[PDB]
Amino acid sequence: GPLGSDSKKASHILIKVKSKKSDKEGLDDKEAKQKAEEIQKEVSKDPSKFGEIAKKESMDTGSAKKDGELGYVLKGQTDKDFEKALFKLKDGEVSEVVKSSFGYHIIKADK
Numbered sequence: 001g002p003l004g005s006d007s008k009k010a011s012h013i014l015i016k017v018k019s020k021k022s023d024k025e026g027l028d029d030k031e032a033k034q035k036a037e038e039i040q041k042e043v044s045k046d047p048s049k050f051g052e053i054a055k056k057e058s059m060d061t062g063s064a065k066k067d068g069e070l071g072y073v074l075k076g077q078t079d080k081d082f083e084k085a086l087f088k089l090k091d092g093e094v095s096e097v098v099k100s101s102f103g104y105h106i107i108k109a110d111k
Contacts, residue, residue: 009110011068014060017103036104044094
């Protein structure tokens with residue numbers, strides 16, 4: 001019979017959570033959650049705008065300057081919450097606000 005793949009192509013956003021009010025690197029946990037929710041509802045209704053929105057709104061400059069693209073993600077490379085939220089997606093589909101050790105993430109599977 002058929003068999004499923006060990007990897008898939010993806011895009012993502014990082015929203016940094018900080019415990020300090022004075023740090024410019026990220027936001028307070030309620031402001032990070034609000035930012036993550038308002039970009040989620042904007043990238044989920046149009047995943048072709050994901051690359052324009054991630055490049056402005058993501059704090060991970062290592063992927064945001066590449067339009068939020070990760071390329072092919074292998075199992076075990078990312079957080080267990082990130083992997084669970086990615087591997088359930090169809091081609092071109094968008095996840096949700098995913099919480100991890102850095103704060104909040106938003107994830108898209110690619111075509």
